[PDB]
Design a protein around this ligand. Structure first.
Ligand SMILES: NC(=O)c1cn([C@@H]2O[C@H](CO)[C@@H](O)[C@H]2O)c2ncnc(N)c12
Length: 553
């Protein structure tokens, strides 16, 4: 049991700060992130669609590079400042808002000073001054915002595309397109057993950022014919850019497995925190908070027409600051507009009635599971689970109503009840309010949801950073690595479909978070001090005074 203590101390060190000044970065990272030749970018230039929204808004490095570009020209720079102001303004609370709102009005709409855009209609200016002072609303400046973006997205965009800044962007992009492999990362101790493989911590060598690596063993996939499940979780996480769903940064392959590299949630899973963390369950305030986050998560997925179908403690995880994110989306699936889907899938205990009955549905099942979970967090026990068998529990779900203890408050009961209403058409969330009607339950008196979704609300429990919230290494399952299955050409075509490489938005973020972008992107400072002697070894006209003093006394 040296192995246990070893692996644990390693991981915690990586989580601490790698090896000194370089924050986990390999000593040869600059080499690893060496830009390519400009000629090496043309093929790529052509590939990239000229899309304002993609190149200047969605893609953080791309956005930075544009912003940086706009700094070179004051008429632009000031636009960017304006948009910045409004984005802040819109998230500034009621009492402080008008105070903040005037500063903008006075700065960017002074009728004596220079114009904001080349053609700003005067009538549109007077309206704001008026509309503001009486009732400062959230969509106050939408008129100007819209015009500003319409301005930038045409000429300044074109001018940028045709500037050095874009050449830089192309290079940055070239790097993200470079193939990802085993060798990109450092591996650490495993943190769990998935359906199809291990799930261990890991680190990007070049950048030192920590990720979780969900391994899916190539063989175990073919045996269980879970090709759909694997590609599905990928394609889904690839698309979802939610604050409450583990984001995917890389998809690659090895000899033995396909990997998904995912946000690393150091606070561990809610299953651990409910059971193996002192007395079972959480206080009300706490249980509620998570239910509210998990709710926002579901809102996020649903809004992208995705039903999750596997909410449960195992698959909710906690981050460094004690916030949560949904995970394991193998069972998730898209729900086309105006349609319904049937699929008897999930975990025994958390599948709602209509799923168990093998009926058609849209999003009902998730709101059920939120109920189950919100129950389980207060109660300290699954509402339908000592070992029991499958058929018994399903009966328990389909017919018997839930059984409460006295930990539940008055309103705490009603919510779980309404979520565990067995009639899906009458269930909370499914009546025709979506998340809104669940958010509006009085149990969430105290939480401003607008803020929670912006991650501005502090949770009631910050994890201990020095703690590792899961089992030790040898105290973990390991199913029979079954032989009797050869990998064949048909599988290679699929692996090609899966092993995409680095996910743009996350990847780009990684570089900015690890100061790799700033450190490497900038150009003109290093080795720029105009030199003491010209090429032929003679001083300039006139010579540098610091050399003369150094050459004599
Ligand atoms: N796929 C994932 O997102 C993760 C799975 N685990 C662990 O592996 C188990 C598999 O559900 C969980 O209970 C966690 O202990 C994780 N641990 C930390 N961060 C993550 N992103 C995951």
């Amino acid at each position: 049991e040296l192995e246990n203590i070893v692996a644990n101390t390693v991981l915690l060190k990586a989580r601490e700060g790698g090896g000194g000044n370089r924050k986990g970065k390999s000593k040869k990272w600059r080499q690893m992130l060496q830009f390519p030749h400009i000629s090496q970018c043309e093929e790529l230039r052509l590939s990239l669609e000229r899309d304002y929204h993609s190149l200047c808004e969605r893609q953080p490095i791309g956005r930075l590079l544009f912003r940086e570009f706009c700094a070179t020209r004051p008429e632009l720079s000031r636009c960017v400042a304006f948009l910045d102001g409004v984005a802040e303004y819109e998230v500034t609370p009621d009492d402080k808002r008008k105070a903040c709102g005037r500063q903008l009005t006075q700065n960017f709409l002074s009728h004596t000073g220079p114009d904001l855009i080349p053609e700003v209609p005067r009538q549109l200016v007077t309206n704001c001054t008026q509309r503001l002072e009486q009732g400062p609303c959230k969509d106050l400046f939408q008129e100007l915002t819209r015009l500003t973006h319409e301005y930038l997205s045409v000429a300044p965009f074109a001018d940028y595309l045709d500037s050095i800044y874009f050449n830089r962007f192309l290079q940055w992009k070239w790097l993200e397109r470079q193939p990802v492999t085993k060798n990109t990362f450092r591996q650490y101790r495993v943190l769990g057993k998935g359906g199809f493989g291990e799930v261990c911590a890991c680190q990007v060598r070049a950048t030192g950022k920590m990720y979780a690596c969900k391994k899916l063993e190539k063989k175990r996939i073919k045996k269980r014919k879970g090709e759909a499940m694997a590609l599905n979780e990928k394609q889904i996480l690839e698309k979802v850019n939610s604050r409450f769903v583990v984001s995917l940064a890389y998809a690659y392959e090895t000899k033995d497995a396909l990997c998904l590299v995912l946000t690393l949630m150091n606070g561990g899973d809610l299953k651990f925190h409910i059971y193996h963390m002192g007395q079972a369950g959480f206080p009300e305030a706490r249980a509620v908070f998570y239910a509210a986050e998990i709710c926002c998560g579901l809102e996020d997925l649903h809004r992208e027409r995705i039903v999750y179908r596997d909410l449960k403690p195992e698959n909710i995880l906690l981050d460094d600051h004690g916030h949560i994110r949904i995970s394991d989306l193998g069972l998730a699936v898209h729900v086309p507009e105006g349609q319904t889907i049937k699929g008897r899938v999930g975990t025994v205990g958390y599948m709602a009635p209509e799923v168990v009955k093998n009926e058609r549905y849209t999003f009902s099942p998730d709101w059920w599971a939120l109920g189950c979970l919100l129950y389980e967090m207060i109660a300290g026990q699954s509402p339908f689970q000592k070992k029991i068998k499958r058929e018994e529990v399903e009966r328990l779900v389909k017919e018997v109503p839930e059984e409460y203890s006295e930990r539940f408050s008055p309103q705490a009961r009603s919510l779980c009840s309404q979520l565990l209403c067995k009639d899906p058409a009458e269930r909370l969330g499914c009546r025709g309010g979506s998340a809104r009607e669940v958010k509006e339950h009085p149990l969430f008196k105290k939480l401003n949801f607008k803020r929670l979704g912006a991650g501005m609300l502090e949770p009631p429990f910050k994890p201990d950073p020095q703690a590792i919230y899961c089992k030790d290494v040898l105290d973990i399952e390991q199913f029979s690595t079954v032989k009797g299955v050869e990998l064949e050409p048909t599988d290679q075509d699929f692996y090609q479909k899966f092993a995409t490489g680095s996910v743009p938005i996350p990847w780009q973020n990684e570089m900015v978070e690890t100061e790799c972008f700033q450190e490497l992107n900038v150009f003109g400072l290093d080795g720029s001090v105009p030199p003491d002697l010209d090429w032929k070894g003679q001083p300039p006209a006139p010579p540098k005074k610091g050399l003369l003093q150094r050459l004599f006394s």
